[PDB]
Amino acid sequence: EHQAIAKMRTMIEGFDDISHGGLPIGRSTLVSGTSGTGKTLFSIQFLYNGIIEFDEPGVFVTFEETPQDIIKNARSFGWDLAKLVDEGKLFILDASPDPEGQEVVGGFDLSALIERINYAIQKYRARRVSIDSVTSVFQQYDASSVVRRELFRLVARLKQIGATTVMTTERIEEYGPIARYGVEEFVSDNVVILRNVLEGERRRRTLEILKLRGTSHMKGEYPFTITDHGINIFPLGAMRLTQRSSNVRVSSGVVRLDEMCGGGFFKDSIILATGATGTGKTLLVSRFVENACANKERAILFAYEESRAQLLRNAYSWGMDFEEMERQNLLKIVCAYPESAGLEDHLQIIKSEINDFKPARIAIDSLSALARGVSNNAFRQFVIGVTGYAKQEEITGLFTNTSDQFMGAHSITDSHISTITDTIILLQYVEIRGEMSRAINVFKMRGSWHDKAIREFMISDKGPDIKDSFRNFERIISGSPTRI
Amino acid sequence: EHQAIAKMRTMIEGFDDISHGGLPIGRSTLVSGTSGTGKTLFSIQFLYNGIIEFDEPGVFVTFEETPQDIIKNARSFGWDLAKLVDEGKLFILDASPDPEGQEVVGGFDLSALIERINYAIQKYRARRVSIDSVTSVFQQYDASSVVRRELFRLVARLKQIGATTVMTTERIEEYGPIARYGVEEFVSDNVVILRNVLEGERRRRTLEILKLRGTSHMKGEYPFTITDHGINIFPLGAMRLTQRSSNVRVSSGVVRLDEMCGGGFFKDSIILATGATGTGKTLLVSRFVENACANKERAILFAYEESRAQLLRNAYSWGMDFEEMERQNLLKIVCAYPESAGLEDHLQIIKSEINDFKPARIAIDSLSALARGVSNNAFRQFVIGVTGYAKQEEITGLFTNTSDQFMGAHSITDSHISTITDTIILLQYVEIRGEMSRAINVFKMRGSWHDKAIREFMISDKGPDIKDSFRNFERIISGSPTRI
Amino acid sequence: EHQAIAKMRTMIEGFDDISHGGLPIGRSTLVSGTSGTGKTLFSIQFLYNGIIEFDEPGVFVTFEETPQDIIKNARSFGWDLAKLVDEGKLFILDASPDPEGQEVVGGFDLSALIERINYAIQKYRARRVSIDSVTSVFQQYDASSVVRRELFRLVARLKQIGATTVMTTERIEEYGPIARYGVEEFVSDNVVILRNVLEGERRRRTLEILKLRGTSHMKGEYPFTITDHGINIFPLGAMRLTQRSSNVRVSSGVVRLDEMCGGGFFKDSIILATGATGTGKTLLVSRFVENACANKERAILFAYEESRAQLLRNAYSWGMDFEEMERQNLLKIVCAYPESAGLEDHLQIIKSEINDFKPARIAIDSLSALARGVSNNAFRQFVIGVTGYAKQEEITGLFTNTSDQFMGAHSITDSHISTITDTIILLQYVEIRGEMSRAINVFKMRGSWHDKAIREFMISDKGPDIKDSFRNFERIISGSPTRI
Numbered sequence A, B, C: 001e002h003q004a005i006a007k008m009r010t011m012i013e014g015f016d017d018i019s020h021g022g023l024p025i026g027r028s029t030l031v032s033g034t035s036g037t038g039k040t041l042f043s044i045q046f047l048y049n050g051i052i053e054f055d056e057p058g059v060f061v062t063f064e065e066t067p068q069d070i071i072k073n074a075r076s077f078g079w080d081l082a083k084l085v086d087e088g089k090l091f092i093l094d095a096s097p098d099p100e101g102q103e104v105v106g107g108f109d110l111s112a113l114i115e116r117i118n119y120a121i122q123k124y125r126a127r128r129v130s131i132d133s134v135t136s137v138f139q140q141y142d143a144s145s146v147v148r149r150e151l152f153r154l155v156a157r158l159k160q161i162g163a164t165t166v167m168t169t170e171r172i173e174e175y176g177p178i179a180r181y182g183v184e185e186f187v188s189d190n191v192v193i194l195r196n197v198l199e200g201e202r203r204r205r206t207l208e209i210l211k212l213r214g215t216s217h218m219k220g221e222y223p224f225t226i227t228d229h230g231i232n233i234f235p236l237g238a239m240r241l242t243q244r245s246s247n248v249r250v251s252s253g254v255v256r257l258d259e260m261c262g263g264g265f266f267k268d269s270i271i272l273a274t275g276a277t278g279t280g281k282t283l284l285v286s287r288f289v290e291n292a293c294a295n296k297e298r299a300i301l302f303a304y305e306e307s308r309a310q311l312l313r314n315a316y317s318w319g320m321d322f323e324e325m326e327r328q329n330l331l332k333i334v335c336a337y338p339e340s341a342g343l344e345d346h347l348q349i350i351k352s353e354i355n356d357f358k359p360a361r362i363a364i365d366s367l368s369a370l371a372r373g374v375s376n377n378a379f380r381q382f383v384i385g386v387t388g389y390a391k392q393e394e395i396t397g398l399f400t401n402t403s404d405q406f407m408g409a410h411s412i413t414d415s416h417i418s419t420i421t422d423t424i425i426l427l428q429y430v431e432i433r434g435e436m437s438r439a440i441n442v443f444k445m446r447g448s449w450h451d452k453a454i455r456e457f458m459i460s461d462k463g464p465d466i467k468d469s470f471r472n473f474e475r476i477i478s479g480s481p482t483r484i
């Protein structure tokens, strides 16, 4: 074969995008990580998908876990391996030791096994093979040099056999040596590292393709999750800037606002409402969500600050009934503390919720709340994620941000996101005659003309009422004006 | 001889600049790095180029990878080694063990290997030799002392034969010892370290020539990329300050602007448009791009904030049709998230795009977007990169920058680039009578006179209209003037 | 000289200052460093200078490099050891092993070597001795204890013989133990450490004299460079504050300014021009340069922001022809990116350029550019260097500094250098009636009276025109004054 490297799809969501096709065929791929990083899961999901998506039988060699457990555990993801074993599509080669035994059986079985495996490969016409914890085999009494030969032998034979393999290795340090003996790294044709980085009492899983001899792939780490559907990876850096854009308009839920936006919000756009606490972002959200229901359209409200019940109370006090919105199955409220999960998990929950409800509009109450603790870079990555998904999905999105300081705020967002959003609505307190009045302002709109006036507005039982600007004032933006 | 030490070109883009001529002839060069750093690639690219550019036969010794694979993978770069083997220009000397290994081979092989290597060198009249992973050989059961002799022997013999060799070693820590045994460094006459530094979930490939006994070379790390054309290194610190400069002018796409600049931008210049989001940099960029097509000249718009579709919707709404621009093959829009790659990659993609399209004008919408996450020094290095490349290429370039704070901004650029640019255009909001108006100002122009007025400007369907200055105001730079 | 120990001069530039006279005679000096730090170069230069300057025969003991290579490599610095070996002034003692060898020899050889070296020393009437990489000798299979005895033996015998020796050693960590076996440090009389510190992708070489039993010396690290002339050290802390001072005046190239400076700049003085980008520092520099040529005097313009071409285009646009300046051989322009090298290198390049051109005036356009990345302490050290050299050299110098923030800048320099400079010229933007006007100001002059006005000035084709002060304004320094 005088062509480039050929890959085999793993069908593990996200992996084939990072690996630019999947694992290189006929070659072994090393997948190491610390305890509980999801090595086993990867190898199994690798075989399963093979069987279910291309009817390519698979051989699974286990050195520690028992075949019963490997099947028992797989049920966690709704995997019935037991069935595939019967259908002879999957064969679990039990290589685990027994409660009793002897010693001085070094490369003895390393050679016998290279046969026992060759046997099952031929017997079931296997295309995919995964060896779980080869590390544990020579974890009997060997040195780095002895380990390099045994691995090289194994890999080499499997390569002759032409099987595409995935080899599991354990590590002890999240950023230290790639594998226990710091030898596997160089012996494998392909290296995949699964990390379960701590950092601030939170855990964050990331997968990285260190190398793939002969082809290209995406570099660095990528967050992923382990759910009821296995390993889910998000190639946030793979998302293309090819979002669809239209001139269609939609309402904000506030007529006067719609006018200021020169005809309303664009369907294909991301809106940001910024302001100190109390300015009324949460109000605009409510009103934006209600407007989608008034037009019998589905909308989701991801609230990260108020409870399900409180949102109702406050919404009802502003008129708009959220009760009905839910019954009519037009509005879906989520609610969860940012601390209840990492950004990766949240991002996913947001996605799935969107898939199981086909929203036309979406509102995330307080992006700034999700920014708690997390690093600015980990956050921006989350914003680009949710932002983009919504964009390429034709879903109009309204996001809320509470600035750290009321009055005087010199920047729209503290996290610096205003450069990622299409429309910016700015709410601000204005001290006038010993009183705290409000003001609304369409800071920017990429497609429309929008009003440039800073209009004061009040809040009542009816909702928001946008009045006039403070034409006779100076230093308004500062918060503490000066009448001329 | 009675002179310094002659070098041999590797023709590896960039390397010969870093090494002040290439590898020292008749000596061996140690190239080490962690797994997946590009050791092999370097060693092969060294032979291949030797063959293809000077018809200098090469011997490739391999201790782990199979000859078939080595040829297989090289295809990844449109490398046909199998052909060169036939033509007897390249000889792959298989030194790898067999699936049925045997004990103690740390002496027979050394002299036997050299016999073979020597044999092959003589047989094909080899000029270049590269041994891949000498590390693996004594990775049988040896100590630093035993390792030091064997290497010394190997290097010495190769020296006698007069072979200019490339030796590959593996590491385990990106900044720990230079090679496995902490001995190889001192035995080699030349040392090259390939690094694949993590840092923030991203990976950065660098190359450093630690030492070359007998001559000079650039010091420090240098970023490089592995592409379909192999290793590509950018000696960003080797670019000379000898850019060509002329008095030729060019339009901005805005006539009034051109007036304020004393007759338009200089062809040989770098312009920077700074301002808060919404001020209209993205507009000035469009008007800049269009003006290049209206004069039937090719221009590239590297957009890192808006999608391809959006840029078109907003552009049409400002008049100017981007659609036609593309068909006429005068305008090329790229678009991509800054998170989709590291600066090094981006820099390259910008370059290649420039070479395959011979642009006259280039505009990067938001350098400030590419500065996300990345360190300031890494960023400045990128800026100097794209900036100088444009200057020496006679390409007029317009760059965008969004200041983190609207109104009050005390510095032009948060990243501090304004000292690297020729002409600066500043956009800023001005609160006037409860309204958000804009202002445009030619902050500086190195060769021209340019207007000193801070003119207010509106934005319409037609585009940008630069009106008059606020002669009757004070503290305008601040964003909240004081009418007088 | 009040020092209890007789020293021998190395003639290595800067070392004898650091060592307070050179290497103690009849004693051994350990010189250790990581790979590629300059150990061999140091030891060779030590013998070479010994032969060329004092006709002191030298014996060079090599354990790894070959006598041919040592001679071949020395040609890099234009030294012909081969010639010296013939004349019988230099003897290279080959102690390296052969590419056939065995096992066991690092002991009696220690006695065989001792007797060998004593032969050479007696035969050539040697006075200087340098043993390159003694480390590698017991790098056969020894423990810390065995090493200490062997070294002590060697050292001891060398002392009896009366030879002044230089012993080279290798280290693995830049700041870890002094030498491999952590035993050499205490056995030697003097210890010198050569470092090659990374830090931010750049490499900085430093030399330190840790100890000298019996005398004093300069403490700490000192930056040095390896050039075509070998090791070059800069004892930046050895520079005495005894610069010559005169009342002689010189023009700035701008008559009005000269008036402001009470009759022009002082010949013996360092001037600082600070202001935001666009203020015109680059202009004043040009005019400062041109004026030295108009009076048939040589001047160097070190530019770190503009290309050689651009400087010319802009200079011509301001009248003054730089073309002629060069031809007449009165003006020399350099140009180079600050990223093209570390401060140490830059400093040295500036010095050499000054020696090979005997300038009367010098102008570094933008020190603030050389401050990119580098640490403030490393920067100040650079400024004190260039500044001091200039002073003791009767060379007038004009340095430029761009402030990170236009208007509002509360400090003259962000780097805090203004305390090192004699005369400070401040340029700044003044918002007046919706327009950006410039203001020039002589902030301070140590020996003169100077004008205290903050005059506004305009820039034309003719150049800088200094007009009058804004007497009817308040808050001028603020950038946006108030008309009273």
Ligand SMILES: Nc1ncnc2c1ncn2[C@@H]1O[C@H](COP(=O)(O)OP(=O)(O)OP(=O)(O)O)[C@@H](O)[C@H]1O
Pocket: A033, A034, A035, A036, A037, A038, A039, A040, A041, A042, A076, A077, A226, A227, A228, A229
């Ligand atoms: N349905 C599920 N939903 C979410 N997480 C799950 C589910 N099932 C298992 N997990 C998680 O996945 C992990 C299982 O790891 P796995 O057995 O795949 O291999 P490993 O941790 O890489 O290696 P080892 O064999 O040492 O455990 C556990 O840490 C567990 O918390």
Ligand SMILES: Nc1ncnc2c1ncn2[C@@H]1O[C@H](COP(=O)(O)OP(=O)(O)OP(=O)(O)O)[C@@H](O)[C@H]1O
Pocket: A276, A277, A278, A279, A280, A281, A282, A283, A284, A305, A314, A317, A318, A402, A459, A460, A461
């Ligand atoms: N019935 C009501 N009548 C008049 N004003 C109301 C009423 N309910 C709430 N408000 C006003 O609205 C404000 C609360 O606004 P809101 O729930 O919209 O969110 P927010 O200001 O964006 O964010 P946060 O959760 O930080 O308060 C209060 O400060 C109050 O002045």
Ligand SMILES: Nc1ncnc2c1ncn2[C@@H]1O[C@H](COP(=O)(O)OP(=O)(O)OP(=O)(O)O)[C@@H](O)[C@H]1O
Pocket: A185, A186, A210, A211, A212, A213, A214, A215, A216, A217, B033, B034, B035, B036, B037, B038, B039, B040, B041, B042, B076, B077, B226, B227, B228, B229
């Ligand atoms: N066409 C290509 N485009 C981009 N990257 C590629 C391409 N081909 C290979 N690569 C990358 O180059 C690397 C190959 O490294 P290489 O085989 O040259 O040596 P190494 O990693 O230094 O040592 P080892 O022999 O242990 O792998 C892989 O990490 C892979 O991602």
Ligand SMILES: Nc1ncnc2c1ncn2[C@@H]1O[C@H](COP(=O)(O)OP(=O)(O)OP(=O)(O)O)[C@@H](O)[C@H]1O
Pocket: A418, A419, A443, A444, A445, A446, A447, A448, A449, A450, B276, B277, B278, B279, B280, B281, B282, B283, B284, B305, B314, B317, B318, B402, B459, B460, B461
């Ligand atoms: N049809 C239009 N009519 C009037 N104004 C418009 C129109 N389209 C866009 N605008 C205005 O232009 C602004 C957006 O400007 P632009 O796309 O040029 O880039 P920018 O401000 O430099 O960067 P950013 O991407 O952060 O907005 C909006 O704030 C809006 O007021």
Ligand SMILES: Nc1ncnc2c1ncn2[C@@H]1O[C@H](COP(=O)(O)OP(=O)(O)OP(=O)(O)O)[C@@H](O)[C@H]1O
Pocket: B185, B186, B210, B211, B212, B213, B214, B215, B216, B217, C033, C034, C035, C036, C037, C038, C039, C040, C041, C042, C076, C077, C226, C227, C228, C229
């Ligand atoms: N003409 C020259 N100009 C600038 N640098 C040079 C020149 N010649 C050699 N060098 C540099 O000097 C260094 C030589 O180091 P040297 O041979 O003196 O000893 P070492 O590095 O301390 O020890 P080792 O014997 O392990 O190499 C190299 O790192 C090389 O880059």
Ligand SMILES: Nc1ncnc2c1ncn2[C@@H]1O[C@H](COP(=O)(O)OP(=O)(O)OP(=O)(O)O)[C@@H](O)[C@H]1O
Pocket: B418, B419, B443, B444, B445, B446, B447, B448, B449, B450, C276, C277, C278, C279, C280, C281, C282, C283, C284, C305, C314, C317, C318, C402, C459, C460, C461
């Ligand atoms: N022919 C000219 N006529 C009028 N003004 C000019 C002319 N040439 C240049 N200028 C002005 O001088 C400014 C550039 O100044 P200059 O080159 O002196 O250095 P600088 O401001 O100190 O530093 P920087 O390199 O950051 O610009 C421009 O902003 C412009 O207003």
Ligand SMILES: [Mg+2]
Pocket: A281, A282, A305, A365, A366, A400, A402
């Ligand atoms: Mg809220």
Ligand SMILES: [Mg+2]
Pocket: B281, B282, B305, B306, B365
């Ligand atoms: Mg934009």
Ligand SMILES: [Mg+2]
Pocket: C282, C305, C306, C365, C366
């Ligand atoms: Mg300048």
